[PDB]
Design a protein around this nucleic acid. Structure first.
Lengths: 62, 99, 208, 100, 84
RNA sequence: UGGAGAGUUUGAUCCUGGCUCAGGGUGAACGCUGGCGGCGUGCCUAAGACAUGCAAGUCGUGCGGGCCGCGGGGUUUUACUCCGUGGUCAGCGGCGGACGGGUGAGUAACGCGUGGGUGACCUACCCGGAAGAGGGGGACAACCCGGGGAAACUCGGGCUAAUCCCCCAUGUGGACCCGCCCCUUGGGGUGUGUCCAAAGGGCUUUGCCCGCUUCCGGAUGGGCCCGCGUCCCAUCAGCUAGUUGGUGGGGUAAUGGCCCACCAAGGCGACGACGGGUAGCCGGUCUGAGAGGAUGGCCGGCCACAGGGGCACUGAGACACGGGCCCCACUCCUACGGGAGGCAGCAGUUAGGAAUCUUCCGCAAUGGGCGCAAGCCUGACGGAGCGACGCCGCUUGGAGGAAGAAGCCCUUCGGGGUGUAAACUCCUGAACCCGGGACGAAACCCCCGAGGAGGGGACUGACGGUACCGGGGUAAUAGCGCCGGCCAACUCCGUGCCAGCAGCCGCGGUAAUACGGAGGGCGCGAGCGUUACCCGGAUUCACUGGGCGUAAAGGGCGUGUAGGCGGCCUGGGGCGUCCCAUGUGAAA
């Protein structure tokens, strides 16, 4: 299981949501991780791929 | 806890009782009949085939042997007598017996 | 929700206006004549070679954009268009035009799409006895669009009908500024309503 | 009604009952060409009268025994030694296909 | 036992029953031997009623039984009437 | 009335071709955002185990009784009893429990779709038809006497009734038997001899209602049987001694070895037998121009299962989900002597999984079971609740509005953009306030006639005062993928083969249009992306619609079996084939 890229913590449980999709990297990359799940909740500050990259609605209060 | 499916098994026990006794009597009377007829006397076993006939009706009427079944028993029973009468005997008297 | 807001931003987007908003986007600009061309920081920075399929997508938009309806339902009544019988393209057009809201607009009760569909959803339209909100409710030959009784005493309705008198209605659109009505007569064709749009492009596109 | 079919008598070897090679053919629900097919049936002969070949019209009747379905009501031809020959050539082939 | 009954179809809050003969066992919105009529107690269409009294006379004359809403339907469709 | 292709193999072209994408869907799931309403849909996993509440009852027009109640009859009155008796509890008795109902485990099946045979058959609660309902007898409850025990319930004794069980009857008829006429698989009649009936209850009583006896005919469902089609592995090649067949028995409603006995060697197989993996089947469903592929959940039909297995019983019907017996586990109650239980019924707990809901209302409508009716059970059904899971409709506004403010993105300092968008303007008027207010249901029922047809009046709403009609009126949620070619849309800083995106090719190795940020714009919008599963493009298992000189591929070559197919001509056949009549193909 890979991950959704930048901004991780994960340590060793997380419930990494086995997903699915290799690339030209890590002879596997099948069954990814999701953030949000039971751990990770995305990049500390993300402004796009918040469909996996955790972050809710950047409510910058202004 | 409560369900009158106990009614079922009670009355049903009584009905099984009915079937048991009556059907049993049927089988045994049939057997005495074939015994006597096998010997070479007939007449008594034809009054016993009379009694038998009445009995197989008692079957037919009830929930024991249903109509056609009782009929089949009647038939086979009457059939076997005739042939095994001729065998060393001489069919003289007749009730369910036809000349 | 049906887009709304900065609208004739769409007008400039096509490169060809669509009245969309009356009194202004009909006056000396549908955001056009001021500065007519597709918006954004780019816009006036040399056009390209948009592919056939792509200018076709644009055409499909274009068409759905003049018909102030979600491309959702543009599509929906396109499925219904390819469903039953009728000259696919031109009949699809007439099927779009035969909708209560632009019936009310082209009648002249309203001054463009936004206003039209608003008034229509406001059930100010009595067709054959009943006021009907239901903007995407298409009428039938022999029916007639009317307006409510207290709605005879409405400001810009009166003003619309005032500036309307003299402006001859569509051929299938029967006017009636006396009985306060509008007979939905026959079923119009491309030569009854001409808008910068190709029917077969919408077919070919949607009917991939 | 009561479905019938003619058929080449195979094996008289059973007492008062013979087998019958019945035959049909039909095209292909996705491949044109008509295909020829075999299907054996039970030829019922209370008074043993049919032998090696005797093509007869045969009749599906009341369940006679274990798979003892079909019967006979009329003959057609006899001495089908050629057909029965081919049948037995197939049987030869069956006794000519060993995996052990 | 063969009875004549009603099988409602439609949706949630747009009733319309199928006036239809069937056997006792046959469930409601299920299967029927033969269909003869329709009845919608809602009254939104002037065609809220239809009775195929011909085959109804068949079923009645061949050993079947009616229902209650039937009772209404029969007394209101000449199914009962004997003219004279 | 129905067919779009594209990227990726080179220096460059072409061909074969694989991968990938654009696409459509779903009982979805996941993350991000989330307003109103309609119809749908909702354990896709462990056929893993369940607390509790309900789901099959009903009938006094079969019968006796308990005992609560009352006028109160009898007893002069008494103890109290005792006649009528609403009741009320069980019992004996009667009908449903075999329908309603859920899952899919098994099952590759005469199970299912399908076409018929039954001269091999059953069919109750019902419509017609015929002969009718003579007389007598016995036994057990409930109840009264005693016991065991925690209960479960269990043991014995003593009585009463019956639409409870028998007895010789009465015998149109039905049943068998041996003959006989017609038939032709056991179809119908007929000559001889024997067997069978019946239940009575009600009342406006001399008549009917409800039921009963004997048969025939239909209405209706199924039993058996064949025809036919029915996943895959040939690295599953042989299989079989109840085995193939008969005679003679037994059994079922009945054909047949399904089982007894006795017996002659046969019964299937490359038309893929045997084996084993896998699987409910269908009317249908999604996709593709189509051929077809895949699929079968809500619904409708057929099957099968009842914690696993055996098993009978009862009966019109069962091997019987809320009936019985036993083995197996498994869990629970106890005083540990003993005993109980099955949510694959319905709501609800728990194991399980990324995920599949309320421990709700009414029998008012329909439908089922029972009752002469009044009526009664019905978690069937008919209604609200919850979840954007699906599809549909819908408000967040209209209209004036700047050479265009400022706020922020960009710059060659001239400005460009954002955007009529905003603000200011007037207009309407979701939400919401008051008022009235539904259809969904008129039959059943009593009454005139006769209890028939017909006629009249009257009773009957769970939703909910919700829908909707009238008036008063507030501008009142906006998100999700993207902007390297397929695929529509670029500018600015950072980041510097690092952090990283990626379905394909790949992109960054210190000026990235692919990362990441910010303005803008592409798409869609109460929704958008992601993954998974399925059909397509894939003409990429090619029948339409392919191929084997060198890309993947002739068997090293001759032989021959079966099989495949076949020269000219006449005529007979009418099997394949073609034509119209015609049965069915339900409903949806």
């Amino acid at each position: 299981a890979y991950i959704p890229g930048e901004g991780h913590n994960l340590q060793e449980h997380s419930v990494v949501l086995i997903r699915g999709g290799r690339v030209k990297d890590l002879p596997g990359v099948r069954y990814h991780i999701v953030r949000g799940v039971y751990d990770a909740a995305g990049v500390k500050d993300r402004k796009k791929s918040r469909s996996k990259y955790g972050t809710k609605k950047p409510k910058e209060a202004a | 806890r409560n369900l009158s499916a106990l009614k079922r098994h009670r009355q049903s026990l009584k009905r099984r009782l009915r079937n048991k006794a009556k059907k049993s009597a049927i089988k045994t009377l049939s057997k005495k009949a074939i015994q006597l007829a096998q010997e070479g006397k007939a007449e008594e076993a034809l009054k016993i085939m009379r009694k038998a006939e009445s009995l197989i009706d008692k079957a037919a009427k009830g929930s024991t042997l249903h109509k056609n079944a009782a009929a089949r028993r009647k038939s086979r029973l009457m059939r076997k007598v005739r042939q095994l009468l001729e065998a060393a005997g001489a069919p003289l008297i007749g009730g369910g017996l036809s000349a | 929700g049906r887009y709304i807001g900065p609208v004739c931003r769409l007008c400039r987007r096509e490169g060809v206006k669509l009245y969309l908003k009356g009194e202004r986007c009909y006056s000396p600009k549908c955001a056009m004549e001021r500065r007519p061309y597709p918006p954004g920081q780019h816009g006036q920075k040399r056009a390209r070679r948009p592919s056939d399929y792509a200018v076709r997508l644009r055409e499909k938009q274009k068409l759905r954009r003049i018909y102030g309806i979600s491309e959702r339902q543009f599509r929906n009544l396109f499925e219904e268009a390819s469903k039953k019988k009728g000259v696919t393209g031109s009949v699809f057009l007439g099927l779009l035009e035969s909708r209560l809201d632009n019936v009310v607009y082209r009648l002249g009760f309203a001054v463009s799409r936004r206003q039209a569909r608003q008034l229509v959803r406001h059930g100010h339209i009595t067709v054959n006895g009943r006021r009907v909100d239901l903007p995407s409710y298409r009428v039938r030959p022999g029916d007639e669009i009317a307006v409510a009784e207290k709605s005879r005493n409405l400001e810009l309705i009166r003003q619309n009908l005032e500036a309307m008198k003299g402006r001859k209605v569509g051929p299938w659109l029967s006017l009636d500024v006396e009985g306060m009505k509008g007979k939905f007569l026959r079923l119009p064709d491309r030569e009854d309503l001409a808008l910068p749009v190709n029917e077969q492009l919408v077919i070919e596109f949607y009917s991939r | 009604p009561k479905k019938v079919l003619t058929g080449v008598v195979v094996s008289d070897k059973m007492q008062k009952t013979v087998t019958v090679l019945v035959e049909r053919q039909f095209p292909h629900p996705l491949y044109g060409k008509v295909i020829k097919r075999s299907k054996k049936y039970l030829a019922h002969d209370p008074e043993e009268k049919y032998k090696l070949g005797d093509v007869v019209e045969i009749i599906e009747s009341r369940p006679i025994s274990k798979r003892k379905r079909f019967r006979v009501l009329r003959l057609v031809e006899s001495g089908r030694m050629d057909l029965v020959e081919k049948y037995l050539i197939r049987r030869q082939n069956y006794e000519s296909l060993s995996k052990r | 036992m063969v009875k004549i009954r009603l099988a409602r179809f439609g949706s949630k809050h747009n009733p319309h029953y199928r006036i239809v003969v069937t056997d006792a066992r046959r469930k409601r919105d299920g299967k029927y031997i033969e269909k003869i009529g329709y009845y919608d107690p809602r009254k939104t269409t002037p065609d809220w009623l239809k009775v195929d009294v011909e085959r109804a006379r068949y079923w009645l004359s061949v050993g079947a039984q009616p229902t209650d809403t039937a009772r209404r339907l029969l007394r209101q469709a000449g199914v009962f009437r004997q003219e004279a």
